Amino acid sequence: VILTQLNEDGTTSNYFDKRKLKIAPRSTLQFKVGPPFELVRDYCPVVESHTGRTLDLRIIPRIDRGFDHIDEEWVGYKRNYFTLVSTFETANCDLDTFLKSSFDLLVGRLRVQYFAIKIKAKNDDDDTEINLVQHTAKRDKGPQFCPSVCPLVPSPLPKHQTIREASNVRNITKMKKYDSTFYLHRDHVNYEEYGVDSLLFSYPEDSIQKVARYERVQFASSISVKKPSQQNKHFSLHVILGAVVDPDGIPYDELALKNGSKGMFVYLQEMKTPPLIIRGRSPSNYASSQ
DNA sequence: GCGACACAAACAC
DNA sequence: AGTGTTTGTGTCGC
């Protein structure tokens, strides 16, 4: 009924089938590590502006809620939240140096203003994009929004336990204890240590996330989870690392820039999950029917 | 099959 | 130790 795997940090992931077993909404058993991500590809090379040294990049993603490993499939529920978190790392460049440097895209060089992550859902069989929606903790009593592009600086990915503990914190003292894990406050650095052209100072806002945290995410409510044959559709969640540049023939999305003009989110790397099954609202997807 | 509303159970404090 | 919060899912009604 419950299959348990030991996580990297010593917590457990407890996989169970909601067709057979109903667990409380807030039980820690709803938190678990989801499917591992795999490289789709690398795109545009990035180089440090004087040395010309290639910046090596790696997305570090994990799902921390919403997916169970049930007999060789990864299974989510349309009605329920998932959590997807990601950082990235630069194996050849320590953070302190990285933030003081400046970087170009090797397409012919476009200056990187900042690095950012976006997420996407796709039909894994035909590459069609599927809309995602997020809620706040207030859910129907608050706004719905689509996942946004998240400016980020390189950081280790927090342990599963940490994501779990920070999920619904309000108290100011607890927030202070997690602040350094999730944010860099540019306004608190010594400005005199930085050149005008430094990467840190072309980020759009003073509060810069170290971790992209997409919580309370769902597939759009209109998504069809079965094919006409009644076979399950296969979905996949994608994490894309990009460099945002000022465009004033490679893969990119347009981005609503800070000053208001047309910006470019140039793809650097993309990872994705293996195929995912999503269970819809049918009564037979729930243990109540039995 | 979807939007809305309701109930309930463990969490956060 | 009690109050209000968060989120899985039961249900209505179109």
Q: Which CATH class is domain A1-290?
A: mainly beta
Structure tokens at A220: 């759009």
As beta bridge partners, residue A117 has A150, A241
| Separation in Å, CA A194 to CA A72, A98, A185 | 51, 11, 14
Q: Which nucleotide is nearest to A81 (CA to C1')?
A: C7
Stated in angstroms, how far is A207 CA from C1 C1'?
38
- Round to the nearest angstrom and report the end-to-end CA distance of chain A: 15
Q: Give the residue from A13, A95, A90, A24 showing the smallest Cα distance to A57.
A: A90
Q: Which residues in chain A, range 168-187, keep a C-beta under 7 Å from any nucleic strand C atom?
A: 168, 170
Give the span between the Cα atoms of A106 and A108, in whole angstroms: 7
CA dihedral A182, A183, A189, A191 (to 10 degrees): 140
A168: phi then psi, degrees, rounded to nearest 5: -145, 45
Tell me the nt nearest to A23, Cα to C1': C8
Which nucleotide, over all strands, has the C1' atom closest to the CA of A25? C8
Taking the C-alpha atoms of residue A118 and residue A134, their distance in angstroms, rounded to an integer, is 14
Which residue in A151, A159, A212 sits closest to A186, CA to CA? A151
Question: What residue segments make up the domains of chain A, in order of their start?
Answer: 1-290
Q: Report the alpha-carbon distance of residue A156 to residue A236 in Å, rounded.
A: 24
Tokens of A101: 């440097």
Residues 6+ apart with CB under 8 A from A93: A48, A55, A56, A101, A154
The experimental technique behind this entry is: X-ray
CB contact at 8 A, A253 and A238: no
